[PDB]
Amino acid sequence: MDINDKLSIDSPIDNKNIIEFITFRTDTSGIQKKIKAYQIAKHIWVVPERYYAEPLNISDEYKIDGGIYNENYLTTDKERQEYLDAICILFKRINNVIEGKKLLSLLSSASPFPFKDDTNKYLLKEALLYVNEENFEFKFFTSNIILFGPGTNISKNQVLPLNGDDATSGVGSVSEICYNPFFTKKFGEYSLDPVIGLIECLLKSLYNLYGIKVSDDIKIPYKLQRALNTDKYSYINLEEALIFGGNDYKIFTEKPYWLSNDYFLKSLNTFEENKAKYEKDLKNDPNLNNELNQYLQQKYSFSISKIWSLNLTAFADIFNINIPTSFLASITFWDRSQYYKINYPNDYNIDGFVNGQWNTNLKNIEKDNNFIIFDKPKQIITYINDIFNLRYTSNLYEDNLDIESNNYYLNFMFEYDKGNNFTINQYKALLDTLDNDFIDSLPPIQGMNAQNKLTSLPIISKGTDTENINSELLLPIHYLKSQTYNLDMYSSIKFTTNIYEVVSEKNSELVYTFLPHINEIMENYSINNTIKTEEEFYNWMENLFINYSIDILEKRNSIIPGITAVLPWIGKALNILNTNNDFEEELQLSGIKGLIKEYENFIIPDMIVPDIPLDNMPRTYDDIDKKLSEIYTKNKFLFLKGYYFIVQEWWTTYYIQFIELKYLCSGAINKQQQLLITVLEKQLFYFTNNGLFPFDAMERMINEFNRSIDIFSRISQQALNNVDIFINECALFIFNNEVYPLFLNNVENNINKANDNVLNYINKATSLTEEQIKELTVKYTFSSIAEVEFFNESYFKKITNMDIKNILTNIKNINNLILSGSQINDDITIFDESGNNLNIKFDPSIRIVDGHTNVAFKLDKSSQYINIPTENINFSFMESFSIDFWLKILDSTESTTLLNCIEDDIGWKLSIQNNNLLWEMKDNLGNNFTSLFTFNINNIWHNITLSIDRLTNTFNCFLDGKLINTDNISNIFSLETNTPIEIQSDNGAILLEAFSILNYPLQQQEVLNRYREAFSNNYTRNYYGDILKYNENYQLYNKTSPDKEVKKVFTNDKDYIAIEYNQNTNNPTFFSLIQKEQSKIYVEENDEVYICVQGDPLNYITIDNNQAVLTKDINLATSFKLKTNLNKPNSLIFSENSQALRLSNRLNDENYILLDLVSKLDDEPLNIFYWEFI
């Protein structure tokens, strides 16, 4: 059984599963010391001590950029306990999901080949001999992996295999892991999940256990090296690339493969005979095997093709962690190395970070006594200007991946005999073929001997030191430094647009901004007297948000092909294409290539295989059709490996330069944000430090400014998304018409070549078929240029879209809600259609019934409710929103509630007050605003949409697409509250439908559009607004006499229908529509229908001299074509040809119904021709 989780604490005992062993290699002193470990799981051990082998400290020369190297760490029992607790927490979290516990099951039975002369197994630690008594009791405790603490470098989590020789040959190795979970990086405004750091160590160890390691020699191009004046590539290890999957792993693992480097064949081939030997030698059950058959039967049952599919990014998807899938191994190193301590008991539980990945708010590891973050920035660049004394230094940071030249692309060899392998119908999910329960059920190994061939692994690699290179122009990194503020809190800030001002003094209070509106605001702003009341502080904050929103979100539609729109601020932020010319126009003249350093030594593959052999082989239609088919398809494959080859090269040469711009734009935004929060932050501190405002008022401004931070970050993310799209377009554009056209020209030449090759292959031995070649020709003409083409622009979007997503915040679109619903069985569902704020609650007692053009929720009972949380629904004074829905009041109710979003008498609610809508909303400051719509909702479908525009401070209310109040809301500030939006009647029965809350404040024009779209089905409606139904009886009225009902008159020596006055009986006359054919349930516009008057004989409606007399025969009925007009939507027209029904002038207390030619008034006929059903 899995989820073992000993959960052991301290040192209660040192017996049974708790053992004390001797270290494999020697300590730094040069001696092996005894130590104790704890068994977390079957064959899995932990030891909460720093790595014995690695020194507790090293010289400054040997320190790596972004290490810790603190010696007084994990040198106490409480730290050892903290680490122990940290491990079981992480392993429980691994056991939390199904895939995680499948890996741990595999690890428990992934013992390397236990080869023996009837004695031992593979490498392993020793049991205590009872040397306490100096006894010599020998025993071996099984251990597939051993988890140590951090070694010399705390930041480094490396998996050291105790013998690399057998860890490559396929024998395997029980590797030792030195992993530290307490510190993680950010990469943005979110914290990296420690399980990724530990899962990666487990996967690396699993390769060692299976003996499938790449021997450190097999490397792949990952990315063009980040510098100025280098043009080499930074090569990544294949094993790392397999694990750090992301989008870099999808581009080379498509269905047609690449040079396997023999590894994907060597390892598979080595696996074949390793599987073969077990079944024919070890499965013969030698008596000294000690039940290792089952572990080996399960270990060899799993295919390595499934271990390779285990990438580190799909695991992040399983735990639902956000991770930079673009360049996972490198993108985390492109800035100063900063670590944040994780308090595992508190800040990280079985379900990941407690406070979510963004808002966990950990503390920087910077502390005086211990923990020095040794940072050596590769390529410290200092801008130099001899126009005037100006020297502006900036630090660059790069990954620690080793670098090679452009060889891979130059001397890449396509092996023409690489036909498709594996790729059976079945291979596209994780952990498909293994046993969880069966592996778990197997007892552990507790009795046999163990070998020890400790291959030394002391490959010390003192790294490169920094280079101090000058520069003649202001780099983006220089601009980014200008954006940052590096001073006290108790010191002023000065904004400017002249970058040259800031560079003059390195850490002057002055900071550069590329946002004109923001600079204008800060031109006249003193922390002393500009803001003097709470209300003014809020307003200034609102004013900043507005101006900030306007500057960064600015985009214009582009005339460049392949680009929808262009961000004109990118010029002023990173100093790229930043001339006196407009950025739009500079991009025109300079082109898209102006955004990238063009790589001259770009390699385009040649892809020529004209080899066509000849002979007389007469088998299987002389194997001609087959031979040319397999040749045609191999040429298709060869060209496809070339297209795949050219995509990888474009990725690692040209996209890297684009994702890098994404990184640069990312900061540039955040930076400006940081400035805007800081200028606000200093202002708040100015109040507090000088006393000034009281606690109640102070606490509110603090509370509101804290809230506002994520609101800056909301539109900040929105800016990056505009960048994401803009850059991707540019990235695909470079490939589209600068790499692809050159690659197509090679294929076109090879097409005509291979075409001519097959034409030159006419081995027409003995008698020949002159005609048949031309049939063979069309098959293998190679005319299918498009068929061989695999340029699905979708593919490039799939790899480059949201590749670094939610850097600023996880928060999606806000104030977005549609709230539809569906039925299943007798059961219902209610969800956000837009898929935002999906944590909805409701009782299933609610019935879903047809309404106006939709399905409506029937809130009958008071107990019934719909409860919509406000997790991403902001109602701060800086947030404008609107609410839109359709409502019908089922029963005559004077006073009921509909909506409610109020907590402690703060928030907003909508309710019914004496058949009148009552909208009130009141804020935290005690400013109330209330509005009473007195249009007297009377049991009729109504479109209630009402918009709160926080820009102009206007509250608009539209009913049925028509604006009413348009009051001013200026006196009303933030009414954000935690309580959800509640929808319950409380006093009445209502029908609610199409309940939408919108991110922006609607206007008259757009509201009217929304109202009109609700009629686009062209259904006829009764008076109440409900859609008219066939074979349903109604009362007929002329819309001109609401009070008087159309009533039949029978046995008058003429039977007809007419409106009677002084009725006083109003003998209910019920009419129903019926159609001769295609009998439906819902009555659409423009349908042929007859009118049935309910009566004992059940007579129908016909025409006699244009009168509407009642016949009794239905073949004697008249056909009316129903026409509806939007202006009167609860009204019908019974038109035959170009005459419609009309009411006559009063004659004998009776108004007769007759057909009259329709007379209109600007497309809109008289009120008479319109009829209503009830």
Author numbering: 1 to 1174
Article passage:
All BoNTs are naturally co-expressed with a protective partner protein (NTNH) with which they form a 300 kDa complex, to resist acidic and proteolytic attack from the digestive tract. We have previously identified a new botulinum neurotoxin serotype, BoNT/X, that has unique and therapeutically attractive properties. We present the cryo-EM structure of the BoNT/X-NTNH/X complex and the crystal structure of the isolated NTNH protein. BoNTs are 150 kDa proteins and consist of three domains: the 50 kDa catalytically active light chain (LC) and the 100 kDa heavy chain that is further divided into the translocation domain (HN) and the receptor-binding domain (HC).
In contrast to free BoNT/X, NTNH/X exhibited high thermal stability in the toxin-free state, demonstrated by nanoDSF curves with late unfolding onsets and single, sharp inflection points over a broad pH range with the highest melting temperature of 49.5 °C at pH 6.5. NTNH/X was also stable at high protein concentration (over 40 mg/ml). We determined its structure by X-ray crystallography at the resolution of 3.3 Å. Although the electron density map was not well defined for many side chains, we were able to build the complete main chain, including regions missing in the cryo-EM model. The overall structure of NTNH/X in the free state is very similar to that in the BoNT/X-NTNH/X complex, exhibiting the same domain organization with only a slight difference in the angle between the nLC-nHN portion and the nHC domain. The structures of the individual subdomains of NTNH/X only differ between the free and toxin-bound states locally, in certain loop regions involved either in the toxin-NTNH interface or in crystal contacts. The high stability, relative rigidity, and domain arrangement of NTNH/X support its function as a structural scaffold for BoNT/X. However, NTNH/X has an extended loop with exposed hydrophobic residues, structurally close to the NTNHA nLoop. This loop (NTNH/X residues 128–138) could not be built in the cryo-EM model of the complex, but was built in the X-ray model of free NTNH/X where it extends into the solvent. Although not conserved in other orfX-type NTNH proteins, its position suggests a potential interaction site with other proteins.
